[PDB]
Symmetry: T
Subunit: 145 residues, 12 copies
């Protein structure tokens, strides 16, 4: 019954902070992951993070989550938001509640970005708040408990 959070980052999230740290932003996925680990450790929770450009790596992580003791998922599918029925179906199959996080406002970009294969089965959605969205996701899990 210990809270165990899997944080899943989709493709290209490894690039956070690389190009034009001035214009685009200086926060790195490593910085985000360290901060989520602390916030989860602070609460007495397990947390592990995985980023992948590979759909199958994220699907494997979801498939393995139940036997690893995962209770909650925090997912930023990034590009896969609009494409990955495989990851949607892995989430539906293991039935672990997940919060969908987007750094940016997906409603203010190309029209195709407005469609999510996740939003109808998500247990919550946080967008447009940058990297703070992940910490708010953990806040959301905590505030339920």
């Amino acid at each position: 019954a210990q809270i165990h959070v899997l944080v899943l980052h989709g493709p290209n999230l490894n690039l956070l902070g690389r190009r034009e740290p001035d214009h685009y932003g200086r926060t790195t996925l490593a910085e985000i992951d360290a901060r989520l680990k602390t916030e989860a450790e602070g609460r007495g929770w397990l947390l592990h993070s995985l980023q992948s450009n590979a759909e199958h790596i994220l699907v494997d992580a979801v498939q393995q989550a139940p036997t690893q003791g995962v209770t909650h998922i925090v997912l930023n599918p990034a590009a896969f938001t609009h494409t990955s029925v495989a990851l949607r179906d892995a989430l539906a199959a293991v039935a672990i509640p997940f919060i969908e996080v987007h750094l940016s406002n997906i409603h203010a970009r190309e029209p195709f970005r407005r469609h999510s294969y996740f939003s109808d089965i998500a247990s919550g959605l946080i967008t447009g708040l940058g990297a703070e969205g992940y910490s708010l996701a953990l806040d959301a899990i905590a505030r339920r408990f």
Copy 2:
């Protein structure tokens, strides 16, 4: 430069907790508003709340917000999410950043609910976390500062 939050609740949100407190939920808008006031007072912020079934009352509140010193808006347009171009245009006109909050998962209901007149100009979106979404909205404003 003091943080002043306007919390705006759209139509039917006054009914929270009224019918079948067992099945639907027992939390009341009054309880939500008291909790947001405390959380804002805790941080040294001003906060005022307004619920209305009337589009014009919400539009007036937005129009008046700038001269009242409002810095941030937390908005749950409820039904008006899908209908109120007037409220969208009042938000665009006064250019105060707002976070869009929905209690429920709007992606898991009637198809018409998936369209928001707010999501493309919102500074953040929090859905499907029940009444906790409002407190997370305040958390989001705080975490920026």
Copy 3:
């Protein structure tokens, strides 16, 4: 357990009988309301009527209906048929059965009129029979009892 009917008339229904009584029709909302009151009094029922050009006035009336003892609603949303998610959501929230009435044939007019925010949650639909539709609505409630 006494039958209490709320009759709700949407915008512009106050104009019935005003302009070109020859071409358009001479029956007035006041005449309709008097006739529904008699037909309800005849059956030992309570009935009250409200017309409004204001969405919030109709929503308030629905919100207040349960504590007023209303058992059935007869609703002619008129223009709001195509626009008012707020009134739909107030009806869904209080869960009082309603019959949707239209004077005219909404299928024989502008294409946008064919969409109703009410027809999928209505307990019955009567259109194209003019003012007689309201009395048939009362007949429908009676014939269930």
Copy 4:
């Protein structure tokens, strides 16, 4: 000038009351037809009823209606509501006013059911009131006279 009503029932309406009389309903088409005959006889009217699974049988009945002295039609096209341009065109050709009746709420089912080949040329529409819709149709014809 005597009122002569043709009541037309489309495919599958013969099955009313057959399967799971508890869950689905116990009223039979024969019971409906007997009740409409009485209500019409009560008013001094002619009434005849025809059910068919065959489009051509319903079309023939409409084509023959004028020379039989039919003044009004009450039509439940059932499945043909969404498919039968032939029956629509037979109704348009003989120009006898008809009331469209549906037992169920066609707006609360599969999306394809929301389209009617009849609603734009009907003289009235009654849905979602079960078998009472037919008697209300007769009430509607009477209330015009």
Copy 5:
């Protein structure tokens, strides 16, 4: 190798000339059929005509056409133009060339009338010329020979 024409008339074409001979037209299907027979007899051709309100009767006639020696079909599907995949598929299966005839302008009516299940496999299309369209169809067959 003798030219044998099957003329097929769809539903409601039996009503030609019945109602308001002044406004709508006085020509009858019997008159059309007599005229086509003469024009075909004049040329040394076989011709037989069939009208039906029944899809299956028209489909049977097409299925039987090849063994009857039919070389050409003249088809006015009327309402079935927009609905009868069965008749389309019977025409495709027997591979007898057909000319599609419409009395009226199908492009100047309800939007649904603009779709034909026949026009993409027809060997010719004649519309909007009234009953003369059938005689022009025979002219078209002749002018090929």
Copy 6:
């Protein structure tokens, strides 16, 4: 509790093997029906077959199936796949499980063929395997038992 299969063939299936036995195929509906009868007799099952170009004949057969002791239906609606809401509704009303069979690949033809009024309520779908699809349907029923 004896397995009784009704095999229903839609319009134009009587033409199998008639035209260009070389190009199109030489197997006849009579040959298919004889083979299904043997395969069902082999298993100790009842089986009866009906083909019709008439929608009402297929609907009648479904309506009558329950009192005849039918346990399973094998249906090739052919053209009616895309048109017959009446047959869909007869299948839904009698609630006998059916397997939908198509000889051809309906996804590789005209776009309109991709829509089935049957696929969402079918208990199985077999397409593109020619006449073998029917025998596989019987195999599917057997393999459940």
Copy 7:
């Protein structure tokens, strides 16, 4: 027979000139209204102006216009352009000719802005000319007389 103009301004038009008078514009609704009054007084006409964020206030003003002697309406529905069937239906019901005015180019903004519930029943349309559009509307009424 004296020309009496009602000028109706929709939601948010009260904000003209408030925020960033440099970038957005310095002209105020009060300035526009004073200028229209002068131009109408100059011509010997009555003119009254009403702005409202409330749909029902604009609908009431239209409903009351005929008995007030209004001959012409100049309407800037602003956000209601895309939403208010109630105001459209009030204009249709009182049958006073109206000119639709937009300050901005509605065709050069969000796609949803291209739809007007007014343009098909307007007696004229003037867009993209800023506040001058209202004075041109009065010019248009004058130039007819």
Copy 8:
């Protein structure tokens, strides 16, 4: 009151018979025009023909037709069928009845070809009969007289 036919051929019709006379066809526009002239002279009619690749040349010819005494137009807009609102509007403006002729089956080609800017205002439509369509058009005009 003498019948005067203008035959208008759209772009690329000058190429008839040029490339691969074997595969595509050997009939030339000059041959068609000579044949229509004879058939019109035979009947005591005036006929003139014009082909153009230029929209404005065809529009000018329509604009000039009334003062030239033209009573009927036979039009093959070819590519302009799908594009030329100018030619449609010239035909509507001069209100001379026209028959729309297509050599080919426009329903059996690219999807965009199924749309005609002419079919809803044409006095008749003849397609898929090759060059014979023009002579049938003259037959159609004659058969009206």
Copy 9:
């Protein structure tokens, strides 16, 4: 810096006043052009007018406008409103501000007329005011200066 207006009239505008001067209107393009010339001469402006049924003639006139000293364009594209990307692109390329004028209400006609290739790059739009729209266009240019 002298105001030089090019007035461009699209196809069929030469026909104004020709057919049924009673029903359709008696004003001629020549009368409109004389009136615009006077109104421009009155203000000390240059004005030249060109009507053409030819897209290329209007495009040439726009291309030549800058070196001719044109400051403003008044354009009635008529049929080309819905078709001429070439004229749109010529206007965009020379970047002279234009006002789009339509005599009629394009929103109250065929659905295809609601689309303009001009409205999103126009500096103003005036419709439904008949020939007065052109003079209002000149008024609009003047009122800016």
Copy 10:
């Protein structure tokens, strides 16, 4: 010329039987694969099975199939049914006939599931029969031989 079947299972099919064996089903992919191997060995055929959550692994298996001697493919693309153009194009490129198998009824789920990138190039389709679909696929290959 020996029959060699490649059975390809898409993402998440490894989870069969894992979660709630009571509600969802107890059959495992390992059980399915053992049964297909036996049924193929029984017939003297080669069969190999591969499941992958990785699109590239399935594409590689198809690319390699021809040189491995594969004659037939049985494919359950699962989530990739709706997404994998790469796998479709690998199947088209190697031109080995495949049968598409789905455990569930894809027509009775989310609307997006109704689209297959495989159904138009499949040599057969079997859906909604659970794990028996794979054995029926082998039956289908056998029944061709």
Copy 11:
């Protein structure tokens, strides 16, 4: 068998280099045409160039190309890309292979620009490379030989 290239430039391409040579570009159509002539002369080829704002001039040039000995066409339809079925049909009729060239990225502009009446019958497509696209087109023709 000598390579003879026709280079066709659509409307507005004559304006290249005219307005704001700094921002938009300084290369002129005359410069492009001189460069293509040299590159073709270099290879021993014939080349002629034609620009026109007139659809009929481009169509005439295509119609005349075969008898002039043209082997290849390089076409920049510019605005006509989205509108000219006449030019498409002239290219299809003469069956000379053409390469479609666009200076700009048509996928990165207004949505309507994404549709080409040429791309499905082109022998190649080069976009977004500015004036270099034409020289690459010649390179493409050469590299085939």
Copy 12:
């Protein structure tokens, strides 16, 4: 500042030349890659090539390109053209200009192929020229320098 080209080939491009070298083509990816290397070496450029059936391998290559010194990308996404938002977003994130190359005409195939997730952010597009498209891409990069 040395030109370094990354050539990326998507799924199934490894199969070039494998099956039916006569019908489909004999050129192999290895032959293409050798030719691009020579052409780049000829110009003093670096070039490396990567083909993958795996989306993540192509995304990794793009992510790594900037630190490897890549200046230009030549990309043939093949099937991923229509599916890979991940690869689009990797290209957008590293902001290296890319030319999109397709061997075939994507506009002349299945409708779904007409959509590219790349064309709106590409620096150029070359299609339908077979393997020569890649060499033209290098020509395009050179011709800019």
